[PDB]
Short mmCIF file of C-alpha atoms and ligand atoms in Angstrom, two decimals:
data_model
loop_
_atom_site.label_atom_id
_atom_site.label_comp_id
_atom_site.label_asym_id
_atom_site.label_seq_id
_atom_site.Cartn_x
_atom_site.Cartn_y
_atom_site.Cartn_z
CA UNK A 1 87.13 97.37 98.41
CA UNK A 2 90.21 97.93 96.12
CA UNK A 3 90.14 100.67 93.13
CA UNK A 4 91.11 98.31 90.53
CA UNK A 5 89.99 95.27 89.15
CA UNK A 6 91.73 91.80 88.23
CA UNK A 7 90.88 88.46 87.07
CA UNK A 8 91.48 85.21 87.35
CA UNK A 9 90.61 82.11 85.35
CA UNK A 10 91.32 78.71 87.59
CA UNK A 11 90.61 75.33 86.80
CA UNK A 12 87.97 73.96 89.30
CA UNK A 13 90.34 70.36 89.87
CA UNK A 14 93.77 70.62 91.12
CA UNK A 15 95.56 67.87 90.06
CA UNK A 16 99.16 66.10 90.63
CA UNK A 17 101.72 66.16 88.07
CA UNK A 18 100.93 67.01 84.12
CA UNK A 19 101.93 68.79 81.64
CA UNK A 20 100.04 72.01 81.01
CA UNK A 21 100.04 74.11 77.63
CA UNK A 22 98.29 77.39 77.28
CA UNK A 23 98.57 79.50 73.36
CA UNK A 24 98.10 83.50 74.49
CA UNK A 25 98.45 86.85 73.98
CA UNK A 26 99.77 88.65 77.49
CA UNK A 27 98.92 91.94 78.79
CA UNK A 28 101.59 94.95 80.22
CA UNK A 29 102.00 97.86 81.01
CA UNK A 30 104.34 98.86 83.95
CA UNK A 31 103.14 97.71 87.23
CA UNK A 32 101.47 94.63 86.00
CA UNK A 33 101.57 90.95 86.46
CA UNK A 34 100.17 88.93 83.54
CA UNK A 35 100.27 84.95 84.60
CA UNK A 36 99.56 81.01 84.00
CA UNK A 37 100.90 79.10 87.15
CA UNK A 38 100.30 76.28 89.24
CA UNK A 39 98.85 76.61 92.61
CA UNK A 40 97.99 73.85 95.78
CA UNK A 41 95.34 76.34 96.92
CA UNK A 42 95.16 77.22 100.57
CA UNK A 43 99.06 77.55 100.35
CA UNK A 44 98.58 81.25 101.43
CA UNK A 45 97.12 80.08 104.99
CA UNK A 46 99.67 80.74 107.45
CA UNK A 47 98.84 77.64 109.35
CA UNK A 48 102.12 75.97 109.10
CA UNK A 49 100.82 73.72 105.86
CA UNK A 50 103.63 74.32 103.07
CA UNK A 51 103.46 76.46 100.15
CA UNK A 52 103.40 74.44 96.36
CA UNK A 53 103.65 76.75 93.55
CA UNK A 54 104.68 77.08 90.24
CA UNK A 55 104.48 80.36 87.69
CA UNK A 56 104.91 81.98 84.33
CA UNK A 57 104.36 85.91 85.08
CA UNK A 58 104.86 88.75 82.85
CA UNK A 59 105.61 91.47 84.58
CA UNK A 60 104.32 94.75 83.09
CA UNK A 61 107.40 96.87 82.59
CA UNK A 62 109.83 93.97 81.22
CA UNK A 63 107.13 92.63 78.04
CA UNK A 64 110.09 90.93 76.25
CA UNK A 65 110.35 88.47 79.12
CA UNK A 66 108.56 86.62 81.91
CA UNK A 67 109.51 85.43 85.40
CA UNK A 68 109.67 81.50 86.38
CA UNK A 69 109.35 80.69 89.99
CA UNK A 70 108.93 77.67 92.31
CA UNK A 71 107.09 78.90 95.87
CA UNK A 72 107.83 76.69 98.26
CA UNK A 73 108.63 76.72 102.01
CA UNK A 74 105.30 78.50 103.81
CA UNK A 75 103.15 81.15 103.97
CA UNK A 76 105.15 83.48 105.77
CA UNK A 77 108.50 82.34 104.76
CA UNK A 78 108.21 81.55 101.39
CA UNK A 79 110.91 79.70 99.69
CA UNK A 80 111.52 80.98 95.85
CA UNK A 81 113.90 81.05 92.52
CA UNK A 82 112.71 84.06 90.46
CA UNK A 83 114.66 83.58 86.96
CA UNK A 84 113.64 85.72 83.59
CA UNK A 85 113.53 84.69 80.33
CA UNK A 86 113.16 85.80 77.23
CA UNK A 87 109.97 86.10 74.71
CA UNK A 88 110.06 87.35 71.36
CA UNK A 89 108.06 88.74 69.93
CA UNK A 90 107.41 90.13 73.26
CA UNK A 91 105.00 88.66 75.33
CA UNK A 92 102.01 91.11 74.79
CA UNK A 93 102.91 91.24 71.56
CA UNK A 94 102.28 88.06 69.61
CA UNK A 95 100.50 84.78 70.68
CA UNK A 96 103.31 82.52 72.20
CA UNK A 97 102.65 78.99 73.92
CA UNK A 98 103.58 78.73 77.56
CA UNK A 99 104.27 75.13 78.95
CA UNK A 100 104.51 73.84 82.13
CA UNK A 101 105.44 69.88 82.97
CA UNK A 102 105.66 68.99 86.55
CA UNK A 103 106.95 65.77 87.76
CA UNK A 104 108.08 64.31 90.68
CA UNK A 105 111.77 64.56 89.41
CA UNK A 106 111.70 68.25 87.52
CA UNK A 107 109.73 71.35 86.20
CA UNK A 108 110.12 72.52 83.02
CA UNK A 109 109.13 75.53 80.86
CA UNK A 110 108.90 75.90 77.32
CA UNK A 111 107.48 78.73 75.13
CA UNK A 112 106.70 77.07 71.61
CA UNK A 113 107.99 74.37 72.55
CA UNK A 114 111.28 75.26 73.55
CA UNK A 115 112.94 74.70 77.07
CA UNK A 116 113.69 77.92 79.03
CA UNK A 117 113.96 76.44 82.44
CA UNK A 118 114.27 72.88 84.11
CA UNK A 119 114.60 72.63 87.64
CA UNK A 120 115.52 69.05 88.76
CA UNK A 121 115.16 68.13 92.63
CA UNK A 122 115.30 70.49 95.28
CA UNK A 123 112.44 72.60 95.73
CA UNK A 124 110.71 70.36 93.04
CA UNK A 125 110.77 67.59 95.76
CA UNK A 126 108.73 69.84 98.29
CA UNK A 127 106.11 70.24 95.10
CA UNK A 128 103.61 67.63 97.01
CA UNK A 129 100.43 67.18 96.83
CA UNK A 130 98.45 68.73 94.11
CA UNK A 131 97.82 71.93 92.01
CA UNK A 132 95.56 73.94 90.11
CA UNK A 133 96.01 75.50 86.33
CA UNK A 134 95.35 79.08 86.95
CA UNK A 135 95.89 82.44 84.70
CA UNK A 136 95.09 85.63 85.93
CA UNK A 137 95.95 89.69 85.80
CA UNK A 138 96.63 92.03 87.99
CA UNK A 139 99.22 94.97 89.77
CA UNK A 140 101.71 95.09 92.06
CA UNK A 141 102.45 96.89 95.06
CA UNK A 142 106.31 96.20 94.69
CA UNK A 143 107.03 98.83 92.13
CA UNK A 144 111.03 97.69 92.75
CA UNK A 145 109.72 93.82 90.75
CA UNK A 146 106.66 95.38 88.65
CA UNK A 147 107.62 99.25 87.98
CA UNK A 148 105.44 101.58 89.04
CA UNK A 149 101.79 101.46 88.36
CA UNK A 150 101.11 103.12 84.87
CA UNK A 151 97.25 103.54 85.41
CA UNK A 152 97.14 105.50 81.78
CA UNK A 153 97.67 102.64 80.24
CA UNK A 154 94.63 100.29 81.66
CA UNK A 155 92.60 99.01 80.12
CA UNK A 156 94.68 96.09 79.38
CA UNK A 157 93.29 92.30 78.31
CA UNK A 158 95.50 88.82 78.60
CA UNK A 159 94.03 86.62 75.57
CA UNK A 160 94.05 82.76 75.94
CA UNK A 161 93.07 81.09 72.70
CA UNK A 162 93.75 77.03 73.88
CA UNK A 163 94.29 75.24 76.59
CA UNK A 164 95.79 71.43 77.04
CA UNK A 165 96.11 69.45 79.60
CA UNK A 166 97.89 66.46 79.87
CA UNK A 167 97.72 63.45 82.90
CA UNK A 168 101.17 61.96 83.80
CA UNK A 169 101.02 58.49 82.89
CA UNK A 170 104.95 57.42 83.28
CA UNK A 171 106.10 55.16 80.26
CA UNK A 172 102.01 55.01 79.79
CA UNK A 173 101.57 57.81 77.03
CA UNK A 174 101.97 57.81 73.40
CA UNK A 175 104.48 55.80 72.32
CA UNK A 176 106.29 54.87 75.40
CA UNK A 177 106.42 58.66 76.83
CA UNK A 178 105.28 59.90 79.99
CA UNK A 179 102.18 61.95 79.68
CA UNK A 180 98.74 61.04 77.71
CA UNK A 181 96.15 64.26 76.93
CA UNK A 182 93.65 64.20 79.13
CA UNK A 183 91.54 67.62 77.67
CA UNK A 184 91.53 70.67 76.14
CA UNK A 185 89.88 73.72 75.44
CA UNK A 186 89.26 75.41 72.52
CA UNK A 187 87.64 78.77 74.78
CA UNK A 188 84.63 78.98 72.04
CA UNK A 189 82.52 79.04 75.71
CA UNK A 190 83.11 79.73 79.35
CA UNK A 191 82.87 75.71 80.30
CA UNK A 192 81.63 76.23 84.09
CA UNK A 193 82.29 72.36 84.58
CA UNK A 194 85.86 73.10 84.10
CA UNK A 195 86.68 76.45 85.33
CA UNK A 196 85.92 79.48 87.66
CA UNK A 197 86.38 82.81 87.91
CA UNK A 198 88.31 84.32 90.58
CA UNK A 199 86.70 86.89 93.89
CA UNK A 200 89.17 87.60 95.41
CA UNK A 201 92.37 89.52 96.61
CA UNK A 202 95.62 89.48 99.04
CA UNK A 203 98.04 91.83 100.65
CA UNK A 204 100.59 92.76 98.20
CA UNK A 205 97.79 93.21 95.04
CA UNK A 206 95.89 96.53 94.26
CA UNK A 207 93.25 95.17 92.37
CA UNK A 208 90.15 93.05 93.15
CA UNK A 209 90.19 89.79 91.07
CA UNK A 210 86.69 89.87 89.59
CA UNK A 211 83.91 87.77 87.74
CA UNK A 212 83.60 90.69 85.86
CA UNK A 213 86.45 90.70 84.04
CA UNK A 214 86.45 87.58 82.49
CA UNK A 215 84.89 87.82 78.60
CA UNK A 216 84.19 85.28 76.08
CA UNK A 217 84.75 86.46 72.70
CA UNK A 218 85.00 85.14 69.06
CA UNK A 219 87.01 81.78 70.81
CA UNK A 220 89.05 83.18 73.14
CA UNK A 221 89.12 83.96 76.95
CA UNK A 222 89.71 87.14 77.92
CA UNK A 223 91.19 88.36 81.76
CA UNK A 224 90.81 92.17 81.92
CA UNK A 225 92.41 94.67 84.13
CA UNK A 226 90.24 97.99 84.43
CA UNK A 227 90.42 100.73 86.92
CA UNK A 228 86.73 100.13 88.90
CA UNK A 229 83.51 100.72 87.61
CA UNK A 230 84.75 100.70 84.15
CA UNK A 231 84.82 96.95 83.95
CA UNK A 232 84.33 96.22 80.04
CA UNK A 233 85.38 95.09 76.76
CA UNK A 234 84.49 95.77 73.31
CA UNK A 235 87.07 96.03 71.06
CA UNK A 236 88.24 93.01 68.62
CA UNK A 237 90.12 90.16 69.73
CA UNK A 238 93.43 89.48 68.36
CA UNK A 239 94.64 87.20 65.55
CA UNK A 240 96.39 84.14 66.01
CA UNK A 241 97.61 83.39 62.86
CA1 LIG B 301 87.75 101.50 97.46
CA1 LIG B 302 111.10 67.65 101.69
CA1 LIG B 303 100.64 105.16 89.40
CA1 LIG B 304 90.02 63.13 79.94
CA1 LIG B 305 83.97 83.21 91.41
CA1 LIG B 306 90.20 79.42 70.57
#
């Protein structure tokens, strides 16, 4: 029913603890929200169930950073720690790789490798359960966190090249460490095995998350935000070189 439309790219398993590493290209423009975040779906149910989330958002007016958060608490009365860091070259404009570890003792972020956030205890202790890996694109209502909506500048594409994914295995992995690969993805195909492709919406979002704007081309993954009914892509995919 929304005017816009989104997408989302989610891994099918959730699972609990890992270390998660994605290599791409983000999209802004002012009023957007470029992501790759962990998510315990269902946390959005206002049931009295708590909230377990973890993100890496661009938001579309601030390209030269991105927003860390922890969502905890419940829907309704969310519990968060929005901090911004950093990216260069900026986020939308060069291929960068976002990490995520999650333990039961911390969360930390890296971009090529290097730490821009570690949040030890506290609201990591309330990150039970399990999560999803998820990536999408989309616009905010909240012009105050995203800017206001620049629809001039849409279409706009997020570009994943690479995916891993690593299983915690404490004093298990490689050498003594604490994680061991468990799989990646290369993106030369949409694995349906593996992932799905988001429907949906929720209060707070303009756009429609869509099937429809998820492209595979020349191996990458692309999320696309469009204004509605002009849901395509057909331009060239970026270099990661
Ligand atoms: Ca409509
Ligand atoms: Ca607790
Ligand atoms: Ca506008
Ligand atoms: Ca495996
Ligand atoms: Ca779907
Ligand atoms: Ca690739």
């Amino acid at each position: 029913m929304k005017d816009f439309s989104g997408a989302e790219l989610y891994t099918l398993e959730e699972y609990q603890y890992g270390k998660f590493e994605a290599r791409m290209k983000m999209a802004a423009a002012s009023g957007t929200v470029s992501s790759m975040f962990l998510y315990q779906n269902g946390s959005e149910i206002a049931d009295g169930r708590p909230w377990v989330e973890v993100d890496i958002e661009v938001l579309g007016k601030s390209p030269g950073s991105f927003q860390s958060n922890i969502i905890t608490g419940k829907a309704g009365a969310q519990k968060t720690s929005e901090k911004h860091h950093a990216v260069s070259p900026a986020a939308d404009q060069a291929f960068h790789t976002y990490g995520l570890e999650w333990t039961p003792n911390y969360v930390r972020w890296t971009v090529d490798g290097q730490e821009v956030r570690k949040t030890e205890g506290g609201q990591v202790s309330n990150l039970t359960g399990t999560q999803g890996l998820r990536f999408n694109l989309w616009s905010s209502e909240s012009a105050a966190w995203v800017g206001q909506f620049d629809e001039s500048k849409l279409p706009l594409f997020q570009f994943i090249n690479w995916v891993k994914v690593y299983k915690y295995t404490p004093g298990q992995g490689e050498g003594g460490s604490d994680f061991t690969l468990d799989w990646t993805d290369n993106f030369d195909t949409f694995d349906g095995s593996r992932w799905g492709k988001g429907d949906y919406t929720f209060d707070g979002n303009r756009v429609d998350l869509t099937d429809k704007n998820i492209y595979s081309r020349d191996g990458m993954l692309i999320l696309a935000l469009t204004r509605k009914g002009q849901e395509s892509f057909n331009g060239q995919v970026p270099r990661d070189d």
